Design a protein around this nucleic acid. Structure first.
Ligand SMILES: Nc1ccn([C@H]2C[C@H](O)[C@@H](COP(=O)(O)NP(=O)(O)OP(=O)(O)O)O2)c(=O)n1
Ligand SMILES: [Mg+2]
Ligand SMILES: [Mg+2]
Length: 424
DNA sequence: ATGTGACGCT
DNA sequence: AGCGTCAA
């Protein structure tokens, strides 16, 4: 088995929140700019960065006051603020624009606000019958890189030389060749990305490969505004110098333990181990997954899911602002519950469903985890005052303070999340 | 003082 | 039911 059964693509919008703001404000287009929230602390936290500003070293999470030191001409757009909280509605609506266009071409898995996987296997088979026998011109792939090629002057000349080498060697007479399927898959993704750009103004990158991990990896190789085809044959050289942390799901603790326990650095080095060895170090599931993945084989399906399964609303209360009175907790719970109710009502009207569970999460001062405590209760009425009261009820006994109107230990985060959706 | 979601393990 | 991991 070689894991060449499917054609899968990952589409990822380039500097997404920036593009949404640059579409709306033409003065920001083609400029070093960033999107920021909460202007009053250090000029605001940076959440997205145009590629022009990245060349100066501006990054996500950087304070805008500090970004200005690296990039004095940097232009800023502020996220909307509602009820004292950053409001991301504009970017969720822009995401829907993009997801609905992609859904015209194939069934998508919404992976994040600006990324979706697509299983192109069926669309590829149909295109191979309609474009039966006729070769694939390089003009059908104007923004495609073939990873690993050319082999054997300027950036665009390199791109085309590699594409020419790829197409020159392609067996068009065999409608079952996996390389031909990826290539036809890339033709469709070109058409998909053109449609996104035409109908929204947004540019994106894409990876085309045989599974989600390779498609995700391929996508980043030539970002922005380009797509990359990673074939099965390209995997050994690509993985031979690919740090383990770059493969999706190996960027955290498991990936660090793969490095530390096995004494390796690159994905290809995993091939030296038996499946049983990897299962012994990392578990039956992780071990089996690593054994196949380091050969470029992965079976996680593109799930047919265009809608989030949870709808959540959180606010941080760092340092000195940590909530320390019962009246503060109740007022902020109400603020979050009101935004959640607005989102839930739109969701019920748009998507014919209703959340039936409310999860309440709090972080206490000094805890390095995102969530110190999670409790749930029934979500029976999209009513902000009821949701906030119920949320307070399930967490009120976390209060350690002997004084009633006080709250201790102070709360550095509140989080309300509606979940367990059923048809409505 | 950075500020959403999806899924695994128990 | 509640916590931990991983990624946008
Ligand atoms: N930790 C993070 C990562 C991203 N985001 C937002 C801002 C991003 O523009 C948007 C898409 O995330 P992203 O793809 O990781 N980065 P972005 O699209 O801005 O730049 P690219 O590198 O994809 O071109 O999610 C966030 O709010 N918090
Ligand atoms: Mg992106
Ligand atoms: Mg993304």
């Amino acid at each position: 088995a070689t894991g060449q059964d499917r054609v899968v693509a990952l589409v990822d919008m380039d500097c997404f929140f920036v593009q949404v703001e640059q579409r709306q404000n033409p003065h920001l287009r083609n400029k070093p700019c960033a999107v920021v929230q909460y202007k009053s602390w250090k000029g605001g936290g940076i959440i997205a960065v145009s590629y022009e500003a990245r060349a100066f070293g501006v990054t996500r999470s950087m304070w805008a006051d500090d970004a200005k030191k690296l990039c004095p001409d940097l232009l800023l757009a502020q996220v909307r603020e509602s009820r004292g909280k950053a409001n991301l509605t504009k970017y969720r609506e822009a995401s829907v624009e993009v997801m609905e266009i992609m859904s015209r071409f194939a069934v998508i898995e919404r992976a994040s606000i600006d990324e979706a996987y697509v299983d192109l296997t069926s669309a590829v088979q149909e295109r191979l019958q309609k474009l039966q026998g006729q070769p694939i011109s390089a003009d059908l792939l104007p923004s495609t890189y073939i990873e690993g090629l050319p082999q054997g002057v300027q950036k665009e000349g390199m791109r085309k030389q590699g594409l020419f080498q790829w197409l020159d060697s392609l067996q068009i007479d065999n409608l079952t060749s996996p390389d031909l399927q990826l290539t036809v898959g890339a033709v469709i993704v070109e058409e998909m990305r053109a449609a996104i750009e035409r109908e929204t103004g947004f540019q994106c990158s894409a990876g085309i490969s045989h599974n989600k991990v390779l498609a995700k990896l391929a996508c980043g190789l030539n970002k922005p505004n380009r797509q990359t085809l990673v074939s099965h044959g390209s995997v050994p050289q690509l993985f031979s110098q690919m740090p383990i942390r770059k493969i999706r799901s190996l960027g955290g603790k498991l990936g660090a333990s793969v490095i530390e326990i096995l004494g390796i650095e690159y994905m290809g080095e995993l091939t030296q181990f038996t499946e049983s060895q990897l299962q012994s170090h990392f578990g039956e599931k992780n071990g089996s997954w690593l054994y196949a993945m380091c050969r470029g084989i992965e079976h996680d399906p593109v799930k047919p899911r265009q809608l989030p399964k949870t709808i959540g609303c959180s606010k941080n209360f760092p340092g000195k602002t940590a909530l320390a009175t019962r009246e503060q907790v109740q007022w902020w719970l109400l603020q979050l519950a009101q935004e959640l109710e607005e989102r839930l009502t739109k969701d019920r009207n748009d998507n014919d469903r209703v959340a039936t569970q409310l999860v309440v999460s709090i972080r206490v001062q000094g805890d390095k985890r995102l969530s110190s405590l999670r409790r749930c209760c029934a979500l029976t009425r999209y009513d902000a005052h009821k949701m906030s009261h119920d949320a307070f009820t399930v967490i009120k006994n976390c209060n350690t303070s002997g004084i009633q109107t006080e709250w201790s230990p102070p709360l550095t985060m509140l989080f309300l999340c509606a979940t367990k959706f059923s048809a409505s």
